[PDB]
Design a protein around this nucleic acid. Structure first.
Ligand code: MG
Ligand code: MG
Ligand code: MG
Ligand code: MG
Ligand code: MG
Ligand code: MG
Ligand code: MG
Ligand code: MG
Ligand code: MG
Ligand code: MG
Ligand code: MG
Ligand code: MG
Ligand code: MG
Ligand code: MG
Ligand code: MG
Ligand code: MG
Ligand code: MG
Ligand code: MG
Ligand code: MG
Ligand code: MG
Ligand code: MG
Ligand code: MG
Ligand code: MG
Ligand code: MG
Ligand code: MG
Ligand code: MG
Ligand code: MG
Ligand code: MG
Ligand code: MG
Ligand code: MG
Ligand code: MG
Ligand code: MG
Ligand code: MG
Ligand code: MG
Ligand code: MG
Ligand code: MG
Ligand code: MG
Ligand code: MG
Ligand code: MG
Ligand code: MG
Ligand code: MG
Ligand code: MG
Ligand code: MG
Ligand code: MG
Ligand code: MG
Ligand code: MG
Ligand code: MG
Ligand code: MG
Ligand code: MG
Ligand code: MG
Ligand code: MG
Ligand code: MG
Lengths: 131, 67, 122, 200, 169
RNA sequence: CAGCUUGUUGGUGGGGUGACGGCCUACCAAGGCGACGACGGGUAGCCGGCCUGAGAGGGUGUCCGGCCACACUGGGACUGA
RNA sequence: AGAAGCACCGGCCAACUACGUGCCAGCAGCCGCGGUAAUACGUAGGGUGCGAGCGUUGUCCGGAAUUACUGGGCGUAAAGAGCUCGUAGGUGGUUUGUCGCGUUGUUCGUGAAAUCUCACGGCUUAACUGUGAGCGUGCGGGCGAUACGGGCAGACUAGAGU
RNA sequence: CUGGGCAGUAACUGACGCUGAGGAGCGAAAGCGUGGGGAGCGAACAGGAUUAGAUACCCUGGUAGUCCACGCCGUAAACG
RNA sequence: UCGAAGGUGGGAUCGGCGAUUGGGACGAAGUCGUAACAAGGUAGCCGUACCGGAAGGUGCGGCUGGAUC
């Protein structure tokens, strides 16, 4: 059934980035709304908000496109799967497109990027490479 | 086993090659000075001198017994 | 294929075949060389090839090819057998070292002379 | 072992004059042999093999010794073609050539090999000595008043002395300032194709 | 003064009533030597009449390859028909390391420092198309900042910021 | 190779040992291991290392250095720290 | 002045002509070469690669992303069990609190010497050798972090069942 | 006599879910066991024609079997 | 008491040899057919049954990786 809700989150963003939709909508959780903040601070999406659905809450994400039809998100890739968990120390944090990408590292100090978890010296779980 | 209790430990550990957390179990024989332990029984142990051929542990205390 | 399958039934590479048996770990191996005779090749490439049924000291019986022109092997000559397999002969996987125990070298060689076994000039 | 053969023959195959000035070259600038004037097939392995052959017979270095120079050129920081020509240049017979104490490369090899040179007052007779920084290259006190050494006295002007070494006066002794980087190295050869040869 | 390298020439055929009618194809790579490269196939009856068509097609399909001063910006991997070419950047000392098909596209585009490896089919036509599909995936660090709305100092790493200013000074 | 184990798994009282201990002995309880491969068959001294490889891995255990085992084959004590 | 050889020269793979030979003699790692003009067999000349060595065979790793964790596949190429039910196992929606086993930070003990990479030093250079630092992917003890996985005690109705 | 499915109401339980090595059940047709039944069709069979031959195609006949009851077999291009 | 080697006994397991015999692969330019590829001259294959020098033939069910309107 519905396992791995974060890989569904990346999939719903890929399948509407690849179809030039202006916005997505998806069921809400507190881990999705913290990943969506890291996608906003790095400039891969524009502003997201939280609506109110029938049951629970709901997350609605505006996507960003260039002056022409240029994608702002060149890919997405879930890295730590629920069948194979991937953890990384602070001296071998993953390097995504040589530095032009972002890996969403899950540290004890919250969700951080590669650069934010390198100069704070903390490691953790590697959720996804956005780039 | 007449003053001897049998404890099923558990241990989780990375696979050396594939990186998946693997759950494996053991069975150890521990020592009771008084045979009060049913089937269930979250126990706590501490390893000792060799008490028999295969006994190496002792029952320290019992928490949240067989319900 | 679903990582838990590789934990249960892991990978295993294919079985390598022993590509040259009957020497059993030796780079050369001598024999007794019975039945010096002559065999024909396959459907193209017709000639008369010079072979021998050498009985190596591994207590096995293999068929060795005699390179070069001219040889002096009759029935009980001590030959020294190395590897290498002749393509147009179907079941021959061994060769006689020329310039060995009882194989003289090929006479009148002046090119390449180290294969086929030959002193320079006297 | 040394080559000890014809020197123009390996300047014609590589299509490049290796020694300094030659009249046997430029009368026949094509490779030797009975099939000398034929159209050669410009492979990629041929451009990488012959470029390594430009570096061996310019310096007189055999293959198992030139390969060990590559094994530490790729292992030092910086580049690989830079530091390969750096450690080839610091050979002591190449120091005698650039300092103007010999005519060609094959006599700068003998004057080191026959024991006509000290370094720190230490009698060397190996051509593959690698001079470090601040090394003096002095001539033996016995080997003055000698014919190949007095011919290097008045002829100290026709070839340029590089900037990484310095020659001084009546004592013909060579002072090594630093190891040369790129610019003061004479270029008959490009350097990136030797690195690409060993990658095969 | 362009660079051009013919990669492969094969004699294709066509069976008719009488017999066989032969022809020649010749895959040609034409590059600027600095940043541009094009690929044109070309085919004709005569072998120099087919290289002459390969150059005139390759000069009509130029595309800019984003360099940084000797190597590519980030590792890519492109998919041809069934060819797979992995590109990986390099330190400025090591030359081009590629097979014979992918070396032609990279030396003509002007790359000096590259690590290439073909993973899929061994066909010389599709390895070239996979390398072109890999070079389209490359994108500039000043173009990844306009795509994200950030400055360049926090979308590029610290290494390849000062690797650009050592080229033009 | 799919059922192996009866001093086998545990307890008490003695004996033994440099020392804990079915290590041994008498009685009492009926257990212990196993599909996460018990019992069996084939092979092998183990490691720091060595060779290859972009790395991950793959093959190997030769000099040197650590440890183990054996001294014509099989068993046994004695002397002594 | 006392001191040079060995293989190769059709493609892979650097390096070609002449004569003898006529499916013969023979070559060869592959696929192929030789049937009266052979750059592939034998010789001579020439050439290339190395050089006190050069080649052949045996053995292992690479190339082989042809056991694939890094890094593959399964409509027709090799490959979806005839189909379902279910045991062990693997996996798990939203949310509050907590323990700190996994994870992660830091520090002490240990990871012998030699070999290995770096930097200097000593044998005329180099191999070799000494010293200093890394390495030793780990494991044990103490003290921090709680985002995520998991354990414990609850809550919720969207999945599932009635 | 009896199994499943779908839609609506949102009354109820509150993660009870999915898959599932071994295993177990079901499983076209042919076949096999005991006993029934047997119109038509029809392997084996026989005769005729065709043909160099015709152990086949085509034709007239025709036994098992096809059908029923209770068991076994457990295979199919069991396929989208 | 325990106890190595030795002696007797019935089994377990892995290999050699064997008159004779079953198939498999490859050889040459052998003998008898023509089953498949075209509607391959009766559309082909799959499971099963019986039969026949040999391919194969026919029954029952199935597939299109064949047709037909
Ligand atoms: Mg006791
Ligand atoms: Mg030497
Ligand atoms: Mg086109
Ligand atoms: Mg593909
Ligand atoms: Mg392939
Ligand atoms: Mg191939
Ligand atoms: Mg007893
Ligand atoms: Mg006692
Ligand atoms: Mg006792
Ligand atoms: Mg042994
Ligand atoms: Mg590899
Ligand atoms: Mg040893
Ligand atoms: Mg020994
Ligand atoms: Mg002895
Ligand atoms: Mg004593
Ligand atoms: Mg060539
Ligand atoms: Mg001729
Ligand atoms: Mg020849
Ligand atoms: Mg070999
Ligand atoms: Mg591999
Ligand atoms: Mg191999
Ligand atoms: Mg495959
Ligand atoms: Mg699938
Ligand atoms: Mg098929
Ligand atoms: Mg298939
Ligand atoms: Mg199916
Ligand atoms: Mg099953
Ligand atoms: Mg669970
Ligand atoms: Mg969860
Ligand atoms: Mg050490
Ligand atoms: Mg020194
Ligand atoms: Mg050392
Ligand atoms: Mg610690
Ligand atoms: Mg309720
Ligand atoms: Mg199920
Ligand atoms: Mg039936
Ligand atoms: Mg019957
Ligand atoms: Mg019946
Ligand atoms: Mg009946
Ligand atoms: Mg009849
Ligand atoms: Mg009939
Ligand atoms: Mg009924
Ligand atoms: Mg049944
Ligand atoms: Mg089947
Ligand atoms: Mg069906
Ligand atoms: Mg027999
Ligand atoms: Mg038929
Ligand atoms: Mg037919
Ligand atoms: Mg017919
Ligand atoms: Mg037919
Ligand atoms: Mg019939
Ligand atoms: Mg039918």
């Amino acid at each position: 059934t519905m396992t791995d809700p974060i890989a569904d989150f990346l999939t719903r963003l890929r399948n509407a980035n690849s179809a030039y939709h202006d916005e997505v909508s998806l069921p809400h959780s507190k881990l999705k709304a913290n990943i969506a903040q890291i996608l906003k601070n790095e400039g891969y999406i524009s502003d997201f908000r939280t609506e109110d659905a029938r049951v629970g809450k709901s997350l609605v994400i505006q996507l960003k496109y260039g002056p022409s039809r240029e994608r702002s998100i060149a890919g997405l890739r879930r890295v730590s799967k629920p069948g194979l968990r991937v953890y990384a120390k602070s001296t071998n944090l993953p390097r995504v497109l040589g530095g032009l990408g972002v890996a969403i590292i899950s540290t004890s100090s919250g969700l951080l990027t590669d650069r934010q978890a390198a100069r704070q010296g903390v490691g953790g779980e590697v959720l996804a490479y956005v780039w | 086993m007449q003053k001897t209790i049998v404890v099923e430990l558990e241990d989780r550990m990375r696979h050396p090659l594939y990186g998946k957390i693997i759950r494996t179990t053991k069975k150890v024989k521990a020592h009771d000075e008084d045979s009060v332990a049913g089937i269930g029984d979250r126990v706590s142990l501490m390893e000792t001198r060799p008490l028999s051929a295969t006994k190496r542990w002792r029952l320290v205390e019992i928490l949240e017994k067989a319900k | 294929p679903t990582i838990q399958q590789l934990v249960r039934k892991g990978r295993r590479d294919k079985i390598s075949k022993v590509k040259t048996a009957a020497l059993k770990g030796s780079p050369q191996r001598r024999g007794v060389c019975t039945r010096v005779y002559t065999t024909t090749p396959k459907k193209p490439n017709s000639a008369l090839r010079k072979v021998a049924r050498v009985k190596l000291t591994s207590q096995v019986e293999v068929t060795a090819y005699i390179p070069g022109e001219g040889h002096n092997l009759q029935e009980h000559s001590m030959v020294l057998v190395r590897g290498g397999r002749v393509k147009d002969l179907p079941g021959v996987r061994y060769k006689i070292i020329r310039g060995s125990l009882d194989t003289q070298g090929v006479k009148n060689r002046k090119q390449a002379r180290s294969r086929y076994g030959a002193k320079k000039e006297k | 072992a040394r080559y000890t053969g014809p020197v123009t023959r390996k300047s014609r195959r590589l299509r490049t004059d290796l020694v300094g000035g030659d009249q046997a070259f430029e009368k026949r600038p094509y490779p030797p042999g009975q099939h000398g004037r034929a159209r050669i097939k410009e492979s990629e392995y041929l451009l990488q093999l012959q470029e390594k052959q430009k570096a061996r017979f310019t310096y007189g270095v055999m293959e198992k010794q030139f390969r060990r120079y590559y094994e530490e050129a790729v292992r030092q920081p910086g580049k690989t073609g830079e530091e390969l020509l750096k450690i080839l240049e610091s050979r002591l017979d190449n120091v005698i050539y650039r300092a103007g104490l010999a005519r060609t490369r094959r006599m700068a090899r003998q004057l080191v090999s026959h024991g006509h040179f000290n370094v720190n007052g230490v009698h060397v007779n190996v051509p593959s000595y690698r001079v470090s920084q601040y090394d003096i290259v002095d001539v033996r006190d016995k080997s003055l008043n000698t014919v190949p050494f007095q011919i290097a006295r008045e002829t100290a002007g026709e070839r340029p002395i590089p900037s990484w070494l310095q020659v001084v006066g009546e004592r013909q002794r060579v002072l090594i300032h630093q190891l040369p980087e790129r610019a003061q190295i004479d270029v008959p050869l490009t350097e990136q194709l030797i690195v690409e040869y060993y990658s095969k | 003064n362009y660079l051009e390298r013919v990669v492969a020439i094969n004699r294709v055929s066509k069976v008719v009533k009488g017999g066989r009618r032969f022809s020649f194809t010749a895959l040609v790579i034409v590059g600027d030597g600095n940043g541009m490269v094009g690929v044109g196939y070309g085919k004709a009856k005569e072998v120099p009449a087919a290289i002459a068509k390969g150059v005139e097609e390759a000069r009509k399909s130029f595309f800019r390859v984003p360099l940084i001063g000797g190597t590519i910006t980030h590792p890519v991997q492109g998919e041809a028909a069934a060819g797979v070419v992995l590109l990986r950047p390099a330190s400025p000392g090591t030359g081009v390391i590629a097979g014979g098909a992918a070396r032609a596209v990279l030396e003509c585009a002007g790359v000096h420092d590259i690590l290439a490896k073909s993973l899929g089919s061994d066909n010389a036509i599709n390895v070239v198309h996979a390398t072109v599909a890999a070079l389209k995936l490359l994108q500039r660090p000043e173009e990844v900042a306009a795509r994200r709305g950030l400055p360049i100092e926090d979308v590029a790493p610290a290494g390849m910021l000062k690797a650009r200013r050592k080229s033009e000074a």
